[PDB]
Amino acid sequence: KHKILHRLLQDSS
Amino acid sequence: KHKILHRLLQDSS
Amino acid sequence: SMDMPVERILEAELAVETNDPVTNICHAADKQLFTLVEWAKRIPHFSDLTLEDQVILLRAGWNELLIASFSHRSVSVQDGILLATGLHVHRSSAHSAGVGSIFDRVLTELVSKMKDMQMDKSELGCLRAIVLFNPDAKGLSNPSEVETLREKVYATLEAYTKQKYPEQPGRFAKLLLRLPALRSIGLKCLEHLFFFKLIGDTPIDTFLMEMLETP
Amino acid sequence: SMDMPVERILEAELAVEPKTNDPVTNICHAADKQLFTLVEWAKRIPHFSDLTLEDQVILLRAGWNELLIASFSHRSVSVQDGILLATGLHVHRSSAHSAGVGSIFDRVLTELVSKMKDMQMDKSELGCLRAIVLFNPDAKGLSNPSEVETLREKVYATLEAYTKQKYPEQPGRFAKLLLRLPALRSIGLKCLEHLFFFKLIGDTPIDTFLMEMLETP
Ligand SMILES: CCCCCCCCCCCCCCCC(=O)O
Ligand SMILES: CCCCCCCCCCCCCCCC(=O)O
């Protein structure tokens, strides 16, 4: 997954 | 010791 | 360059500015992984890579990128490290907790050398951007692009060292030649972290735990 | 420079050009043989022999693994999907994978051999990079780290003047050469860990000089 890293990278706002 | 390494380095031959 | 301005790399650096010392270090690493993602996003062209390639570069580099930061943060202190949490770890605490060896390598190979040459934040930023743009990182969709980004960063760094330190012709070389030490220290810190995880009895927070997960 | 001539560093590389089925046995055998040659190479690097015996021991103990990996990697630029040992034996990727050492072998091919091949790294450049590895001012126990530091500085000033003179169209060539040193360090460390396991488990002949290098500092 690498859930957290994916969520932080995607997040722009 | 490092016997071999010492013998090879000391040698100037 | 205009492709890779040293201004933007400096702006990225400035934008992010339990007795057990190992618990405190692990807690600080977890917090700094959140900041590290925001730092990477400010490095020119990083965010134009595919998400998969961004993940691969941050997973490969996070350890070296954090060690480079706390090492440069610690040039103000003698025989200690300053964590991002504002906590200080003295050499004597590190030795007392069974991580004297690696702590001394950090002090001797990185902190003292950064201190000796007075490495500035533009130079640290560039070296961190070189570590980030690691064309050897396994599974990259396009190693060539990462290679050219690394090349743009080291062209930018060299023009910066020539412009700012014209009297030190060896300075560029000197900066690049801390990267092998940083790699070696990175690998040894990773082995410590895997052991801490394996044995338990050191709390490891979710983001640091994720970085230690073996796909 | 006059204090660290690139001629002498090339002469050291030219001076050491050479004449079972487990690839791991074959590689360990070649490593033992090349440790003998490595001492002779070090002695031909300007100023190395003027260091104290203790400091010479420290630098060759700290560097031998990287120094041998640089040499066989550069020897292997002409080989498809394999390495050429100093013994004249070839190790193909398929054998390495079949012997349980595929990952590290692929790292050697991908991070070192193919990159040396891509930039066509020459023997003067290899000699310099090996002399930089040798003059490791971070090596623990050095009597005078400062003088090792200045020898490293003389080598990288000599390398950079050589790359500017010979490859004036490749402004980044110097940087590119120095930026194979982190990979060499990383690969070095993983090879060492392999060697210690081969020793621990037995079932790999390990000759006297390689055995000695694996005996604790
Ligand atoms: C420094 C030597 C301690 C040895 C313990 C191993 C811990 C792994 C090191 C990972 C980097 C820590 C990140 C700290 C974050 C910061 O404050 O900038
Ligand atoms: C070559 C990498 C794959 C094998 C992994 C085992 C680790 C062996 C250690 C490397 C020593 C290098 C010896 C080279 C000798 C030569 O030049 O022929």
Numbering used by the authors:
A (entry chain C), B (entry chain D): 471 to 483
C (entry chain A): 231 to 247, 262 to 459
D (entry chain B): 231 to 249, 262 to 459
Lines from the paper:
We next questioned whether PA could also bind to the other two RXR isoforms and therefore, we crystallized and successfully determined the tertiary complex structures of both RXRβ and RXRγ with (exogenously added) PA and the GRIP-1 co-regulator peptide. The crystal structures indeed revealed the binding of PA to both isoforms in a similar manner to that observed for the alpha counterpart. These structures provided to our knowledge not only the first report of the ligand-bound RXRγ crystal structure, but a complete set of the same tertiary complexes of all three RXRs with an identical ligand. RXRα is mainly expressed in liver, kidney and spleen, while RXRβ is ubiquitously found and RXRγ expression is mostly limited to the CNS and muscles. RXRγ was particularly found to be involved in the regulation of CNS myelination, a key process in multiple sclerosis with high relevance also in Alzheimer’s disease (AD). To understand whether the 24 amino acid differences within the LBD region may have any indirect influence toward ligand-binding properties among the three isoforms, we mapped the differences onto the structures. We observed that although most changes were located peripherally at the surface of the proteins, there were three substitutions in the proximity of the ligand-binding pocket (site 3, site 11 and site 15 based on Figure 4a). Additionally, the amino acid change at site 3 with polar, aliphatic glutamine in the alpha and beta isoforms (Gln270 and Gln341, respectively) to basic, aromatic histidine (His271) in the gamma counterpart was particularly notable. This substitution could result in alterations of the protein properties, such as electrostatic charge, evident, for example, by a contact between helix 2 His271 and helix 12 Asp449 observed in the RXRγ structure, which was absent for the glutamine residues at the equivalent position in the other two isoforms.
The nuclear retinoid X receptor (RXR) is a unique family of ligand-activated transcription factors, which in humans comprises of three members, namely, RXRα (NR2B1), RXRβ (NR2B2) and RXRγ (NR2B3). All three RXR isoforms typically function as a universal heterodimer partner for other nuclear receptors, including the type II thyroid hormone receptors (THRs, NR1A1-2) and the peroxisome proliferator-activated receptors (PPARs, NR1C1-3). Here, we report a complete set of the crystal structures for all three RXR isoforms in active, ligand-bound conformation with an identical ligand. In addition, we discovered saturated fatty acids, including palmitic acid (PA), myristic acid (MA) and stearic acid (SA), as RXR modulators capable of inducing the recruitment of co-regulators to the RXR ligand-binding domain (LBD) and hence, activating the receptor.
